[PDB]
Amino acid sequence: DFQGMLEYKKEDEQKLVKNLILELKPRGVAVNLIPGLPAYILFMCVRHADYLNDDQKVRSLLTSTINSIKKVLKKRGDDFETVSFWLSNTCRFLHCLKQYSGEEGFMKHNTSRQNEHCLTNFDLAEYRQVLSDLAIQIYQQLVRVLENILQPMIVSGMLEHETYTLDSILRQLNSFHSVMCQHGMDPELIKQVVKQMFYIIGAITLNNLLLRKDMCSWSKGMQIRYNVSQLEEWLRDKNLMNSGAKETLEPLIQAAQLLQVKKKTDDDAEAICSMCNALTTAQIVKVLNLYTPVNEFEERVSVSFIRTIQMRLRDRKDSPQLLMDAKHIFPVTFPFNPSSLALETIQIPASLGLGFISRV
């Protein structure tokens, strides 16, 4: 009848964080069978220190933990799997510190047995704040690493290819999503990362239309709309249509629609002004100025037509922005997701190299 706590000797604390954090492999069998396993084990160690009422041990374990996570991200900070794994486990460690805090506001999902596993001697609120701030830093690093992977693929994948293709972009998105799922990343965080990836796709693609006459054509509008259709089918396949990702593409979609509509009459001008509610006046006017007719039997958009559009939009008080900030990162929100996992049932796998830890 174990109680869901883990004991270790003071002198072994550096071996503990070495095997549990510094040299722990994100692909290992045990941590893939039980996502968040390192966080759960670390928390069970915290529980025992708290049970002993040993303030020095609690302090030292928490600091060693935070410092070790920082060290692994400094060393392998360009490796997406490592960053994903540690964002997930930092969040799960924080979920544990909350779920088993003994504070009622965090215990609403607990079973009666889980409530028996709450900390009793220490208030770790200040350490939870350090962890939360760390999770923000890790999320920022993750989004940077993933953007650097996707960025070279976007223009060729979305615009040039009729070298990277759209399938290249989808293959990467599939890999990112698969990995975050394997790590047990909070579903709300996965949705934010996907939203952030759709944002850069839309922003880099639109910024290319806005800079290049050769990309502003009826045919390019058709290609973009087809490519967006496949990105939306991807969200549908993954159950991600509530992530906000599709909405990030609306300026691109409207620019593509603008490339295809009629651009001659007063009625056509009125339709453009109603359709392009996600584009600024500067962007609409730029696309119309750059628009390149397929051949001599299609006329350029006239100067007078563009002035009609400017006249109709004259009362909009919109942003002066032309190019999008493609590296803009939406501020992250973190959910609290207490789990059903019963600590008293957690087996310490032999593979982790943690024989010096004992169950209590």
Side-chain angles (χ1 to χ4, degrees), residues 2-8 10-77 79-125 127-140 142-212 214-237 239-246 248-310 312-313 315-347 349-360:
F2 290 124
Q3 296 186 285
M5 295 184 200
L6 300 170
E7 177 276 344
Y8 69 95
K10 178 175 182 181
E11 56 266 31
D12 285 336
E13 184 169 282
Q14 286 301 110
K15 193 160 63 179
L16 174 64
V17 301
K18 183 185 113 77
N19 283 105
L20 219 34
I21 304 169
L22 293 180
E23 302 309 329
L24 191 118
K25 252 63 201 164
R27 290 177 177 194
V29 175
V31 302
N32 277 255
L33 185 61
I34 307 157
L37 181 63
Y40 284 119
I41 293 174
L42 289 158
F43 180 66
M44 292 166 72
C45 290
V46 173
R47 277 192 68 202
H48 192 244
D50 170 271
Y51 175 83
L52 295 170
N53 196 30
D54 187 340
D55 46 289
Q56 198 164 37
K57 195 173 205 175
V58 172
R59 285 200 292 281
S60 185
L61 181 55
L62 287 168
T63 297
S64 290
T65 294
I66 286 150
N67 289 339
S68 296
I69 294 167
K70 288 170 181 173
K71 200 171 177 174
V72 299
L73 293 178
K74 189 183 195 173
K75 190 171 190 176
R76 293 186 74 105
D79 184 58
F80 151 60
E81 288 189 23
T82 298
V83 177
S84 173
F85 183 85
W86 285 111
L87 173 64
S88 298
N89 278 270
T90 297
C91 290
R92 173 61 54 200
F93 186 55
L94 186 60
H95 298 331
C96 291
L97 291 164
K98 289 176 188 179
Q99 178 165 18
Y100 299 104
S101 59
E103 305 171 20
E104 288 302 338
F106 292 133
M107 291 157 57
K108 287 168 176 168
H109 183 71
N110 288 0
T111 70
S112 64
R113 183 159 284 258
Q114 286 179 320
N115 285 337
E116 296 169 17
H117 296 166
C118 69
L119 301 175
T120 64
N121 282 309
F122 297 110
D123 177 354
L124 300 183
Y127 300 88
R128 292 198 307 262
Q129 182 63 55
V130 178
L131 288 159
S132 300
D133 289 336
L134 177 58
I136 291 164
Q137 287 187 326
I138 306 178
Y139 174 88
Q140 289 171 335
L142 177 62
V143 158
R144 177 169 90 129
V145 166
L146 297 182
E147 291 196 344
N148 288 339
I149 294 165
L150 276 187
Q151 188 168 345
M153 306 191 179
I154 293 170
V155 167
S156 56
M158 292 292 294
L159 286 182
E160 287 173 345
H161 183 90
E162 289 183 342
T163 184
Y164 297 110
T165 61
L166 189 61
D167 281 333
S168 306
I169 294 168
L170 297 171
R171 178 166 174 281
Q172 289 307 127
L173 289 172
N174 275 323
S175 170
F176 301 164
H177 181 264
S178 174
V179 171
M180 295 184 280
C181 291
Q182 287 158 221
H183 293 164
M185 189 174 288
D186 295 316
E188 294 76 16
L189 288 175
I190 294 179
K191 286 172 198 170
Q192 292 174 79
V193 170
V194 168
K195 176 184 171 182
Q196 183 69 67
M197 291 311 102
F198 272 50
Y199 176 82
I200 189 171
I201 296 165
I204 291 179
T205 303
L206 181 57
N207 285 347
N208 270 259
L209 294 184
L210 293 169
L211 290 175
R212 299 163 73 184
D214 39 286
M215 295 298 174
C216 289
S217 66
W218 190 95
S219 177
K220 279 297 170 214
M222 171 179 57
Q223 178 178 340
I224 293 169
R225 287 184 46 251
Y226 170 74
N227 291 337
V228 168
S229 83
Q230 301 306 111
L231 292 171
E232 296 172 352
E233 180 79 24
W234 183 86
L235 291 175
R236 190 202 71 82
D237 293 331
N239 296 123
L240 289 172
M241 292 195 55
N242 283 74
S243 65
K246 182 202 183 326
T248 70
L249 297 181
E250 193 57 20
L252 176 63
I253 287 162
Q254 291 182 2
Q257 289 166 350
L258 181 54
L259 294 173
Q260 295 195 297
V261 296
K262 293 179 290 291
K263 298 167 190 72
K264 295 198 177 190
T265 62
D266 284 345
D267 282 343
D268 301 341
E270 191 168 273
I272 281 163
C273 293
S274 303
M275 184 263 290
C276 295
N277 58 42
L279 293 174
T280 63
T281 301
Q283 296 168 334
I284 294 162
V285 166
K286 174 63 72 167
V287 171
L288 295 170
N289 276 304
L290 293 182
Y291 180 79
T292 300
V294 62
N295 60 36
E296 298 282 322
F297 301 97
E298 175 179 26
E299 286 310 312
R300 280 191 70 74
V301 188
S302 71
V303 167
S304 60
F305 186 79
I306 298 175
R307 289 163 162 164
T308 294
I309 294 287
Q310 285 172 313
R312 289 177 175 273
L313 298 177
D315 288 326
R316 254 193 198 187
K317 194 182 166 175
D318 57 3
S319 160
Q321 81 156 16
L322 177 64
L323 301 180
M324 293 179 75
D325 172 12
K327 309 318 277 296
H328 170 76
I329 305 303
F330 297 103
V332 64
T333 299
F334 292 86
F336 166 52
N337 288 336
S339 69
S340 290
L341 190 53
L343 297 178
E344 81 279 9
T345 74
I346 294 179
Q347 171 172 339
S351 45
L352 261 34
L354 299 161
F356 55 92
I357 303 172
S358 308
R359 290 170 99 199
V360 187

